[PDB]
Design a protein around this ligand. Structure first.
Ligand SMILES: Cc1cc2nc3c(=O)[nH]c(=O)nc-3n(C[C@H](O)[C@H](O)[C@H](O)COP(=O)(O)O)c2cc1C
Length: 396
């Protein structure tokens, strides 16, 4: 149905509908589709859906000039450990991705591939089946009790990756980024957020290393920056973004409870801005807001109000995409887009509204999302969500 308790507000008069250049692409609007894992990829081979996926992304590219960041996508088998999430290392997978970008391109929109590495959020048993390691920053601290048990009982205990394995990960990022461009993607986003491998190095709870990859702000950041640096060198700074969740606690990150957390993220942006002034500026930085610390909780819940992402604007001088509970709060978006380098990711409501942008322009009602079909091998809750035209014909 439509959302019942929502008072919509037309946003067409704001900067949300002013064009902006991000990297090589000329966006005609600032409503961004953030990366959204959907678990329709096919097992075996982590293959993008050959029946639904082209249609999923086409539908959501229907407004011209939309930046679309794809779901998390694995650079390598060892990066993985979810059967139904996609990859970009094989010919099989690339062939399907080529078609998905083509469809986005035809709707006059853009496609950036999110390069996803799981670390300790992977399923240790799924990885053991395929004889792969269950990796993280350290081996003496675990995501949760469930995962510790799964890992021991599959004889696949958490491994603290060596320097050579870190290099290997970096090669796989580079190759995965090249593959994305060759297949026709506009750029890539490096997932350094939401408690996945790179975030596990950034955060001091998950990272108990005393080597060059832990034990200080500089060291916790070295991996995230090694990957950014090598991907930029491979494909160019204007085809590279980076996602961070400074106040995230998903997958057992510290959030605001950790007093050094702002400093950790301020250092990373600082270093991005240092590369920028020396002549290699990332296309964007993408921040998860403290408005949403866990995206599987309803809007309003898991909200940290002890901290703000405003510090980022003092440090990083380029485009900033912000995401978390903006669909139900046009009044907040109205104030954030008064800043002329601020874009807004809308996650969950872009799952349920293929024409979300039209609805934001003219203040239309929003389609309600079905949490139970977020992660499910089904057309339903995926490509059968209606446009406002089609929704009136059904009587909502
Ligand atoms: C089903 C689902 C899958 C998601 N998958 C990803 C993902 O793969 N990578 C990522 O960086 N964020 C992911 N997110 C987080 C969203 O990009 C976004 O930050 C979050 O939903 C908050 O924005 P929203 O409140 O507008 O939905 C996901 C969120 C949901 C609900």
């Amino acid at each position: 149905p439509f959302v019942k308790d929502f008072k919509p507000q037309a946003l067409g008069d704001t900067n949300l509908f002013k064009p902006i250049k991000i990297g090589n692409n000329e966006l005609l609007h600032r409503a961004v589709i953030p990366p959204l894992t959907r678990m329709r990829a096919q097992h075996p081979g982590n293959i993008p859906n050959r029946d639904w996926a082209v249609e999923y992304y086409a539908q959501r590219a229907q407004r011209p000039g939309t930046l679309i960041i794809t779901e998390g996508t694995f650079p390598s088998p060892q990066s993985g450990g979810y059967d139904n999430a996609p990859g970009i290392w094989s010919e099989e997978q690339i062939k399907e991705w080529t078609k998905i970008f083509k469809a986005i391109h035809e709707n006059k929109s853009f496609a950036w591939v999110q390069l996803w590495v799981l670390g300790w959020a992977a399923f240790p048993d799924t990885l053991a089946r395929d004889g792969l390691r269950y990796d993280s920053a350290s081996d003496n601290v675990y995501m949760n009790a469930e995962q510790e048990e799964k890992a021991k009982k599959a004889n696949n205990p958490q491994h603290s990756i060596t320097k050579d394995e870190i290099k290997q990960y970096v090669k796989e990022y580079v190759q995965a980024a090249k593959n994305s461009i060759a297949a026709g993607a506009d750029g890539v986003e490096i997932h350094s957020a939401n408690g996945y491998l790179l975030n596990q190095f950034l955060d001091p709870h998950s990272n108990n290393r005393t080597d060059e990859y832990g034990g200080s702000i500089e060291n916790r950041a070295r991996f995230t920056l090694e990957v950014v640096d090598a991907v930029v060198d491979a494909i160019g700074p204007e085809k590279v973004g980076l996602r961070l969740s400074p106040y995230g606690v998903f997958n057992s990150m510290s959030g605001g409870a950790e007093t050094g957390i702002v400093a950790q993220y301020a250092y990373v942006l600082g270093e991005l801005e240092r590369r920028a002034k020396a002549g290699k500026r990332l296309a964007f930085v993408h921040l998860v807001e403290p408005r949403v610390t866990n995206p599987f909780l309803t809007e309003g819940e898991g909200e940290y109000n002890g901290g703000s992402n405003k510090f980022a604007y003092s440090i990083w001088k380029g485009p900033i995409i912000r995401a978390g509970n903006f669909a139900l709060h046009p009044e907040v978006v109205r104030e954030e887009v008064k800043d002329p380098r601020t874009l807004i990711g809308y996650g969950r409501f872009f799952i349920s509204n293929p024409d979300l942008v039209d609805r934001l322009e003219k203040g239309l009602p929003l389609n309600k999302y079905d949490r139970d079909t977020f992660y499910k091998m089904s057309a339903e809750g995926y490509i059968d969500y209606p446009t406002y035209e089609e929704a009136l014909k059904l009587g909502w």
